[PDB]
């Protein structure tokens, strides 16, 4: 309840620490590996989130390294960071001061689901489009998030702005460097991870995004289950068993299936589900990792055409959030897509 003054380092640019005062600190929740507090900046009265993570005495903090590089309207901004000490000894905390966003896609989806109500497809379009932009941006640095789930999609439901958060699982993936998946990609686990791949790529995030889309269309997870084994049974119910070629594309080291055919995608979702949403989902939830759309290709899909209509508005009458403020970095995987992604009225 008292005023706390720290010397905090701005997230972006070289280190230029500033005195920052905040107050009204209270626990509001958690990320995967840190408690999240709300606080009010004394200067502007603005609410911020402070994620407190343990600082290793000998190793750099990877989440901080990644977040200092990022600046995108669909990724939670690292305003500042600072260190604090408990009474223990070697007990040091890294404090990440983040923009505060009050709700998540999961909360809105769960509200609609528990009410037996379909989430309006305009919101599905807006949320998924903004997720795909955030992925296009991080993937352009080689950074894979590895924990894409609806609880990590922050949302202001009135403006419909979505921000990806929680980079505690994220890593730069480099061709030829093996990677593991013990504490990450547990929520919507891509099948190559279930099959034990250590050479996986950022397309694991696109699989997760496909699971988010399917959940928003169905009102429940498409592949529920705690373990990868459990999720795989559920994956087979829809996709059938992977072919020998798909297994080789997922994990060429997987030595040790009956042929079970896929279930038609139109029969997975309720009648009246928009056909383009089903088409999009079928190009995300693919066994072969290289067959999945890239994030930028997904943004350009016909499912998002309504967002490119000149007269589109939110249901509350407000303008849509920013959709066309692309950068070179974000477009870098396929700059010619800019012609389609940004209609003439938007540039």
């Amino acid at each position: 309840s008292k005023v706390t003054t720290v010397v905090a380092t701005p997230g972006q640019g070289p280190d230029r620490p500033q005195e920052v005062s905040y107050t009204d600190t209270k626990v509001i929740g958690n990320g995967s590996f840190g408690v999240v507090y709300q606080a009010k900046l004394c200067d502007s009265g603005e609410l911020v989130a402070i994620k407190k993570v343990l600082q290793d005495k000998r190793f750099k903090n990877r989440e901080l390294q990644i977040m200092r590089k990022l600046d995108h309207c669909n990724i939670v901004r690292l305003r500042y960071f600072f260190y604090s000490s408990g009474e223990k000894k070697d007990e040091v905390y890294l404090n990440l001061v983040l923009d505060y966003v009050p709700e998540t896609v999961y909360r809105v989806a769960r509200h609609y689901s528990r009410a037996k109500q379909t989430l309006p497809v305009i919101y599905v379009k807006l949320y998924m489009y903004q997720l795909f932009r955030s992925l296009a941006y991080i993937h352009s640095f080689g950074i894979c998030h590895r924990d894409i789930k609806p609880q990590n999609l922050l949302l202001d439901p009135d403006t419909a702005v979505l921000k990806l958060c929680d980079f505690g699982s994220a890593k730069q993936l480099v061709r030829g460097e093996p990677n593991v998946s013990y504490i990450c990609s547990r929520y919507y686990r891509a099948p190559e991870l279930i099959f034990g791949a250590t050479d996986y790529t950022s397309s694991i995030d696109v699989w997760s995004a496909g699971c988010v889309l399917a959940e928003l269309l169905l009102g429940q997870p498409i592949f529920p289950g705690d373990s990868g084994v459990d999720q795989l049974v559920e994956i087979i119910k829809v996709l059938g068993t992977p072919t020998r070629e798909q297994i080789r594309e997922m994990n060429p080291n997987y030595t040790e299936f009956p042929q079970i055919k896929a279930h038609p995608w139109t029969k997975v979702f309720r009648p009246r589900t928009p056909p383009e949403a089903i088409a999009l989902c079928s190009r995300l939830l693919e066994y072969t990792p290289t067959a999945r759309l890239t994030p930028l290709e997904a943004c350009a899909h016909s499912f998002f055409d309504e967002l490119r209509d000149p007269n589109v508005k939110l249901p509350n009458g407000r303008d849509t959030p920013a959709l066309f403020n692309f950068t070179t970095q974000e477009l870098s995987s396929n700059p010619p897509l800019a012609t389609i992604l940004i209609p003439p009225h938007a540039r």
């Binding site: 509001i28 929740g29 958690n30 990320g31 999961y106």
Partner: peptide
């Protein structure tokens, strides 16, 4: 409600 949530409270509870 029930499940795994980011925040303790929600207007959508």
């Amino acid at each position: 409600x029930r499940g795994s949530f980011r925040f303790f409270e929600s207007r959508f509870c």
